[PDB]
Amino acid sequence: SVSKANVPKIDVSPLFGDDQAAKMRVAQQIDAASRDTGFFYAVNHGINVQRLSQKTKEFHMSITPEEKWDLAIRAYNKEHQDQVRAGYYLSIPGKKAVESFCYLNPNFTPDHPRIQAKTPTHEVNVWPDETKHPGFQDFAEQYYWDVFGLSSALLKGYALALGKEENFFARHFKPDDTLASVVLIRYPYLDPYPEAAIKTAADGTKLSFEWHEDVSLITVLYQSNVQNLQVETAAGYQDIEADDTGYLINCGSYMAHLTNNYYKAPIHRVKWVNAERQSLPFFVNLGYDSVIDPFDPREPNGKSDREPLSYGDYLQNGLVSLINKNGQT
Numbered sequence: 001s002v003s004k005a006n007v008p009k010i011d012v013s014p015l016f017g018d019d020q021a022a023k024m025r026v027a028q029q030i031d032a033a034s035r036d037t038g039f040f041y042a043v044n045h046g047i048n049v050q051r052l053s054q055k056t057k058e059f060h061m062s063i064t065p066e067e068k069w070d071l072a073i074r075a076y077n078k079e080h081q082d083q084v085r086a087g088y089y090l091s092i093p094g095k096k097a098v099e100s101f102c103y104l105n106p107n108f109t110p111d112h113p114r115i116q117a118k119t120p121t122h123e124v125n126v127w128p129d130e131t132k133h134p135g136f137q138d139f140a141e142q143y144y145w146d147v148f149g150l151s152s153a154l155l156k157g158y159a160l161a162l163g164k165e166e167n168f169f170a171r172h173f174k175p176d177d178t179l180a181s182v183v184l185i186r187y188p189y190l191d192p193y194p195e196a197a198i199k200t201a202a203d204g205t206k207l208s209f210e211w212h213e214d215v216s217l218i219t220v221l222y223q224s225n226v227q228n229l230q231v232e233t234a235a236g237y238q239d240i241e242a243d244d245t246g247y248l249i250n251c252g253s254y255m256a257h258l259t260n261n262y263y264k265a266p267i268h269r270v271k272w273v274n275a276e277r278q279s280l281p282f283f284v285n286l287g288y289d290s291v292i293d294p295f296d297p298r299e300p301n302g303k304s305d306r307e308p309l310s311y312g313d314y315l316q317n318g319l320v321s322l323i324n325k326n327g328q329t
């Protein structure tokens, strides 16, 4: 009754090199996937995902309630009015299964100009005690830059796919000001599983997270090997097969805006599965003042007439809207 989505595996290794024709062949595959279901797996990416999964598991399984309160975002701890994005998102025993830890650009320090100006969406990361979680902060900050590098290469592929010079997106994706985030999500095995944490879709499917478009330019996702994602097509939802060696890639709504919906942001949802698993997205966000003039690849002259949208305004509105529509995570 439920079909399986065509999600190609694309070797992205040429995007790190200087063979221009091989890069074009990767771009063609990105274009094709982006115009079909909107998802592809990036393989030969060079990231040590075994260590990513191990270190994340050690953190999730060793952190205590005391530490979670100390790291909690404002939604769970009224004392932390400056932590809207960065920190711990608590589970609620008997009611809410998912829990997660979100961190932002490690360069956002108290001395950073955007932090000194109190610009919305910029926060300084909070971390657990080094002595209770030795090496965790070092690993997590290094991971940020590893996935930043992969994402920068992917953005070159997207640029070439759309007929632009390879730095068209990447020039706005900078270590000093990127609003990109990593979220380390734990979906636990629970017996009994709290019914309040299961949502029923219109078609009767039991869900952990309802349909949505991503608030991102692109989303770069690593998940353990438990099938859970579905993508909407005109003929209904289709299952995305899991692969715990690759990164699952899709566009967010900022890409849809700037391409006049040529690359749509695919609508997707998370099925309920009672299994211990990890979901580790990196949301590729630009800088607060980054603006890309919209264009329409379908038109010879590329004219669009959609309004340019500052990334900061897009992100602030998008994060709130997603909470209002799909709930506080």
Ligand SMILES: CC(C)[C@@H](NC(=O)[C@H](CS)NC(=O)CCC[C@H](N)C(=O)O)C(=O)O
Pocket (backbone or CB within 6 Å): 084, 085, 086, 102, 180, 181, 183, 185, 209, 212, 214, 215, 221, 270, 279, 281, 283, 319, 322, 329
């Ligand atoms: C579908 C997965 C990416 C994951 N869902 C998610 O991460 C969902 C939907 S994309 N994303 C969010 O809630 C937005 C988090 C943004 C983050 N706090 C920030 O300040 O940047 C899951 O497994 O639930």
Ligand SMILES: [Fe+2]
Pocket (backbone or CB within 6 Å): 212, 213, 214, 268
């Ligand atoms: Fe998503």
